[PDB]
Design a binder for this molecule. Structure first.
Ligand SMILES: [Cl-]
Ligand SMILES: [Cl-]
Ligand SMILES: [Zn+2]
Ligand SMILES: [Zn+2]
Ligand SMILES: [Zn+2]
Ligand SMILES: [Zn+2]
Ligand SMILES: [Zn+2]
Lengths: 264, 259, 262, 256
């Protein structure tokens, strides 16, 4: 069923688990993620973003995202990740994304506030929540508080020692930063990128207030193992294996983040 | 735009070309086919059937098929292939397929007629065309049976068995063409030679179902991209499907025919 | 269920009945007509046209029309009446009308053909049928006209346009006879109000397969409005729906389309 | 455009206006209300409920409600009024109502909580707001009811059904509760008393049968006219009455 990310991130915060965010841009990725969330009885976020528009017609594929979200027996949030403009996130909303992210973190602090608040002020009247982002430079607790209070954003992606994407040496999460940002900010905390982080450290960060974690690369890599294994098989067989591989990886992330069982 | 297969198969029959029927069951196959038909300014048929339901949720993927069909600038027919029950083709129709095949070709002549006519009599009042099959694709079509079959069922088009298989006997096509006037359909045309396809079209084949060849084109891209990032591999699959669909559209003579 | 007017007008022709075309432009009119068709087990045509766009938002109301047509257990055709332009009938198609009339009958013969054929050539590739109209194109002297559709002109018109059905200007049964003999498509009657029951039945026996109801539902509704003018609005509007049902049932039965959906 | 009643009730609360809720169950009622809201540049609530399901096919009419709500240039909330069961409001939600009322006010306090909480607990994970009703409403029961149910707004009994309002009830409930207050059964309350009630915290007012009454005046005025004209006059009468309520309640201009 189409789910509200405010309710579910609140639940995750309060019960000390995190919701997995999966970027899905084709049929097998979408089906594999929904298979995992049904099997685990877990809320889940399915996301599209501008990085996939060269691969897949969002305006058409969104119909399949929304249909599967509606028909699922578990909570499914349809999300637009890393929104680069008002028109892009408006187009996401008109095509049935019920959760949006406006990423203005590349801009100076005041311009990040202005652009984020613009999105909030447009979408709150429509009932649509807006995730924002504020950027080793750790997120500062007092700046995070000011940012959230001033924008009215519904969730905040933070820098806690995690790498947004690729890493050199093992990221070291600063758990004191997590605690202090959690205490300063009234909305749920989000991580964009958790690669290279140990299971024990992910679990600690979740226990201290991380309520949503974006999986950016791992489904693609899990899929490619199935592609490579099945490169001499019929296409139909290869795609059945790609779906299963995606399901297995999504299930691993759901169990690691503690969201299994939380739908019921 | 959602298009009427009766209009387009008539056009094809009268102008001596064939409409390509492509089996699509995931995002890249669908997108690649639509890419080809847009580029070639061609009518096209996009098809799903029971052989794909283990791979893809038709009830959800149908929304993407219908969306792309409606928004395309070329004629797109949404077709349910090899329908072995009223229930499955009724499900297809409620999910936006605007052309149906009722395939009762596994049965004896009388029972094929009764089952086919059942589908025709349900769907014609709803404006939905029904393709039928006489011959199993093995059992070759008999021309005198064909005349009677089309007359009794009222089917809109007839899939024939002329050596085509999911050898090739052009005498059979020739005799069937003189026994019935409805458009003729060729299943299992992946791996028939270019010259034999042109011959079949000149003798009255007006729709040609391509299944395996898109799967083959995809797997070529897979083997060429097996060490690549998944996003890139999938762009290459879509591109490979487009190029193979384009090849078939031009072979069949449907390029340009949308204008 | 959304139904094909070609199939049903062919059925009507071959079994010597006519399908009722009801103009509906609000909720109680739509619901009464569907109530009638369901009770009578009859195909029915529900129509909107330009004459109502100032009363009701077509683009919004169309959604209720299509929904009711889909969910009905009887055949329901969604039809755009008297289409005055390609833009108007295109707008009708994108809002779920599955049957169109392109009415170019006010123009000279060749211009009627050109405008009608334009609609047919656009909409046949999309599977959408087009009803056309040909009135009296007079070969007679101006003096004799002081003292109506020609069958030969009708055959040329249908052949050149490819239209799926033809509205004809006819009470004069010769004209119905001669046009029926000359054209291969179903015949349609507009402006039948006040034709006697007996003559309607004769027109249908001779080849009329669809009959457009004019203001009869409107008048049926206003009898209920008058009767309920001191009642609460919810009660009044229920009686309007019932009055529309009753008038619609009367036409369906007169036309012989009751039972024809089975 | 389809609007969130929580946002708009919050706006009304903070700016001391109320949003009109209009019960609409046919084409002319819906169009006249949307006409008024557009002309006044006002948020509006359009509502259906069980009382109208025999007259009008909700499952079909809902498509026209939703289409008009989406296309409107002003905020339009699609609301199911006086929801009598989980099944009924679930059906409302599946046909595009984005705001629900669960009315368990027939029942004593504990049972009203339980039934209301059942609705909140089902619909909040779907992002759907639930209005409830309690009731004079007692301010301590109001605070406890809101806290225990998690409902998003509360319909209160202040002397509404010559109706004399107790304004002290509105003030004390406003102060005890953190959600917006709603008034049902406003008929016959004076303009001055409505304004006073809004000033003290009433943020949404349900228009009971005043559109129906306006429509019937058009009916009596047009009994000898053709149906197309009568219906133009009904739509115009609805528009006029809805505009009068929007202006009384102060929501004119609040959409921009
Ligand atoms: Cl600010
Ligand atoms: Cl038979
Ligand atoms: Zn980011
Ligand atoms: Zn086949
Ligand atoms: Zn007429
Ligand atoms: Zn006319
Ligand atoms: Zn109440």
């Amino acid at each position: 069923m189409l789910a509200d990310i405010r309710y579910w991130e609140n639940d995750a915060t309060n019960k000390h688990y995190a919701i997995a965010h999966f970027n899905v841009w084709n049929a097998e990725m979408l089906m594999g993620v929904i298979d995992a969330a049904e099997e685990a009885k877990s809320p889940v976020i399915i996301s599209f973003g501008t990085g996939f528009v060269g691969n897949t017609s969002f305006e058409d594929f969104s119909h399949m995202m929304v249909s599967m979200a509606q028909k699922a027996t578990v909570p499914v949030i349809t999300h637009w990740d890393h929104g680069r403009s008002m028109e892009i996130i408006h187009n996401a909303w008109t095509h049935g994304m019920n959760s949006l992210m406006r990423d203005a973190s590349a801009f100076d602090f005041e311009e990040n506030i202005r652009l984020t608040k613009e999105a909030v002020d447009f979408f709150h009247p429509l009932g649509i929540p807006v995730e924002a982002e504020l950027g080793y430079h750790y997120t500062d607790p007092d700046q995070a508080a000011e940012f959230v209070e001033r924008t009215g954003c519904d969730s905040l992606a933070v820098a806690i020692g995690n790498q947004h994407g690729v890493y050199t040496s093992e990221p070291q999460l600063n758990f004191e930063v997590v605690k202090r940002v959690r205490d300063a900010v009234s909305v749920p905390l989000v991580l964009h990128g958790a690669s290279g982080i140990s299971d024990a450290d992910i679990k600690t960060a979740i226990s201290l207030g991380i309520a949503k974690i974006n999986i950016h690369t791992e489904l693609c890599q899990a899929a490619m193992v199935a592609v490579k294994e099945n490169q001499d098989q019929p296409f139909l067989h290869l795609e059945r294996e790609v779906r299963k591989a995606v399901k297995e990886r999504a299930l691993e992330k759901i169990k690691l983040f503690g969201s299994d069982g939380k739908a019921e």
